[PDB]
Amino acid sequence: AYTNSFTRGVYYPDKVFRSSVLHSTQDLFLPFFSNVTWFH
Amino acid sequence: KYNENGTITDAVDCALDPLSETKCTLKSFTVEKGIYQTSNFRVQPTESI
Amino acid sequence: VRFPNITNLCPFGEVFNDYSVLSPTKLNGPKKSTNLVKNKCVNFNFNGLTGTGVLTESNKKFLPFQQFGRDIADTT
Ligand SMILES: *[C@@H]1O[C@H](CO)[C@@H](O)[C@H](O)[C@H]1NC(C)=O
Numbered sequence A: 001a002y003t004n005s006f007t008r009g010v011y012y013p014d015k016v017f018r019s020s021v022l023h024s025t026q027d028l029f030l031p032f033f034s035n036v037t038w039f040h
Numbered sequence B: 001k002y003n004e005n006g007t008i009t010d011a012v013d014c015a016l017d018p019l020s021e022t023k024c025t026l027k028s029f030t031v032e033k034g035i036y037q038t039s040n041f042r043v044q045p046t047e048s049i
Numbered sequence C: 001v002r003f004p005n006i007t008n009l010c011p012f013g014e015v016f017n018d019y020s021v022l023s024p025t026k027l028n029g030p031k032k033s034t035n036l037v038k039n040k041c042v043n044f045n046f047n048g049l050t051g052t053g054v055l056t057e058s059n060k061k062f063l064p065f066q067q068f069g070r071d072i073a074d075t076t
Helices: B018-028
Strands: A002-004 A035-037
Touching: none
Parallel strands: none
Antiparallel strands: A002 A035
């Protein structure tokens, strides 16, 4: 079985305070609308 | 996107659809009407000789 | 110079009874810590971050996993 996330798996890449700052980064993430495997 | 306290409010994948690439080159979540050169493209080889 | 407390003391009381109890001169491993002072141009060292500025009481509020802050141009 399968489903998807629609927006999931976003974590803080570093210990840096920023306030109202758009910030691009390149790291290991989970893509939007991506299939994950159901389990029981 | 960070708020005024340091919490991630929103996020954008820069590879999903070309509207997100347009957002990812302009560093914003709203885009004004126009045309925007984003990236390149290149036909990939199929086998090796 | 600012570093956290010395907490992970290795058990040197379990095979004998910080190498100060005895190149042997540069084996240290605790890290020293002086006290801070405000409103004067000093050379600060916060946990490996080095600079030269005027340290002042703040108004911002962090999140309890964060160490320092930056800005638009990514300056501390
Ligand atoms: C930001 O911090 C303030 C504390 O003054 C809090 O009241 C507020 O709910 C926080 N979140 C926002 C503005 O999204």
